[PDB]
Amino acid sequence: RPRFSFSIAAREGKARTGTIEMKRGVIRTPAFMPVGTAATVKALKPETVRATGADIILGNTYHLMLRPGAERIAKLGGLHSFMGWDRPILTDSGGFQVQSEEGVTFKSMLSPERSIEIQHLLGSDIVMAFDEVTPYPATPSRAASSMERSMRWAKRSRDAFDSRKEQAENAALFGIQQGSVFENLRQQSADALAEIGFDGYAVGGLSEGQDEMFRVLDFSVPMLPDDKPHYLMGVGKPDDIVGAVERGIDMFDCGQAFTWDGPINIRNARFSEDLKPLDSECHCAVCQKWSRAYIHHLIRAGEILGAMLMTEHNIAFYQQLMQKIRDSISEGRFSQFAQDFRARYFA
Amino acid sequence: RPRFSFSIAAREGKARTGTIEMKRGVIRTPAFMPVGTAATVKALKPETVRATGADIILGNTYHLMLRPGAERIAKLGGLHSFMGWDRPILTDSGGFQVQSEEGVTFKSMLSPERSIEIQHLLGSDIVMAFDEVTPYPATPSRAASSMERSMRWAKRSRDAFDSRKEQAENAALFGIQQGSVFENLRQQSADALAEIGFDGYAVGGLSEGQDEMFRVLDFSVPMLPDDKPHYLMGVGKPDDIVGAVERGIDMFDCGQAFTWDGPINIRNARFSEDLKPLDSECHCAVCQKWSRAYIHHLIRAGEILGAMLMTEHNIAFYQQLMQKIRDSISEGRFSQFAQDFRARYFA
Ligand SMILES: CC(C)(C)OC(=O)NCc1c[nH]c2nc(N)[nH]c(=O)c12
Ligand SMILES: CC(C)(C)OC(=O)NCc1c[nH]c2nc(N)[nH]c(=O)c12
Ligand SMILES: [Zn+2]
Ligand SMILES: [Zn+2]
């Protein structure tokens, strides 16, 4: 396998389905990435993460640099080895969880250079440029100043990554579009990132309300290079994913249980004697073996197994959603799927 | 399979190894029973419990009657179905976790009759008689009065169980010896229980210090019927198990990680960069896949996966201990095993 190759197999309107091939594995797109906050996907063994269908997970640079530490993880062999996940890992840059033109110092430093270095020490497969994330709402002046700094930092990120031969040869680098909700700033940002050149392009700064997010995506995603993956950071509700895919997004990150009829809160007393599985159609191991009543009990009792079973179901639901999206786009029936999904999820 | 059959395959001194056959499965003795406090073995799926070698688990009548409730579990199909463990389950009576000759009332009633009924509603395979547990230390007068009440309650337990045909036909009933540390009271209690007749006999009221416990076991276990299982309640340190087996016990219940060189506390900073598994010889899935350094990180970070991995290792260590005990007794080399175990565990 190559360092990085994105192939589009099928399209429907702005929606795409395809594959990212990398040295550690293939990523089916559109993709949902479980989040491994402190070198673990909460309450799941990596083998269980994989069994839900996940092709890639996300690691948080901010949290790992604080505990257990990036240099420590490198000395122990890198994040993949440390946590026992051997497939691709995307790391964020830290711009959300964390000031001057050099970078930021904080109490528990980060800069374009140090962020890229940390992601190298972790052994990330997909590295994110270090950005300045613009609060919402933002005045046009502030959004502009902030986007411009982020594009300067994107070039510094690019140069840092490229200066590290092992990283340049084995990992990919994504740039992050900024500009708040303003079309001209999003265009300027897209142009700047494309001039620098990246392996993929994230839409940052969103996640305001859904209508507003979708309006910004309507004009922002077509600005990005068509032939590279489009990653919407920080957006994970099922409905938000469906509409973002309809607007050209390829990648997403991560008592409430998801069902095809909408979310339920399993702690509600109505579930105390309900022998049905969490969802009627879900193929996951939890829905095969345990009732709503049992999981209700476990979560109300504070038992770790309740967290384990709820998280495995929810991740498996997300991966089933992504599979249904991929198949419907490849079959040219994604519009119909989106309509059917919503009429039931919100019935 | 029969309702209940205990067979002794091999002996060495007072130690025995054999099998209890029951309708839901075979129990290899000497046996260690993981504890399922609120209808779950902490942080483990039942399939993971089984993969460690466990043949039987323990459920706590006190806790289940409070949450989710015994009548509720029966309406949902019984404890086996509710939690997804299809092998034997032993339930305690509640005499430890919880006054008059009728029973006890408390704030979050129990009596011999209601305890047996609760265990029936849960669908327990091995039911414990309801006892009065004697505090330690106890004066001879108090220990005697208390033991006598427990023997009256043992007869009421026997009569309650037998009056329930489905329970009598499908479950087993164990009696509990009392008498504190006094040889004459332990003898009186053994005699009373044998006159009533049970499928197995527990030594209650112990777990004071190890020397004292072992002295009491020296004279108390030979008093119990030889041809039935001997269960020491509430005693679970590895050293305590080895010496209790040497005195004729067959059954036991459940940051610290067990190793063959002694326990370690994985939170200690000395483990922060230790790439070795928890134990050098352990065959468990955790020791095959993850380092001390990773588990150190997880436990210090409060992550659920740390609890999951520590518990699976510890239970697997206990089951490996029990297997080594069983094999050594069957091979007539248990004395040597006990000596070798201690010289290393305490090196
Ligand atoms: C809170 C607001 C709406 C201002 O930003 C976002 O929602 N931002 C989304 C986001 C999530 N993770 C990110 N990592 C980086 N590097 N940059 C980002 O913009 C983001
Ligand atoms: C605290 C002292 C030493 C007084 O008792 C014990 O250690 N007792 C051990 C024990 C554990 N679980 C039990 N369940 C019941 N029904 N009866 C018991 O005696 C016990
Ligand atoms: Zn499910
Ligand atoms: Zn182990």
Numbering used by the authors:
A (entry chain A), B (entry chain A): 11 to 108, 117 to 126, 134 to 232, 235 to 281, 291 to 383
Could you give the paper's own sentences about this structure?
Transfer RNA–guanine transglycosylase (Tgt, EC 2.4.2.29) catalyses the exchange of a specific guanine base in tRNA molecules by a substituted 7-deazaguanine. The reaction follows a ping-pong mechanism including a covalent Tgt⋅tRNA intermediate. Hence, in an attempt to generate a model system for the active site of human Tgt and to gain insights into the relevance of particular amino acids for substrate base selectivity, we adapted the Z. mobilis Tgt active site by site-directed mutagenesis in order to mimic that of the human enzyme.
Nucleobase mimetics endowed with bulky exocyclic substituents, however, generally constitute purely competitive inhibitors with respect to tRNA as their binding to the covalent Tgt·tRNA complex would sterically interfere with the tRNA sugar phosphate backbone.
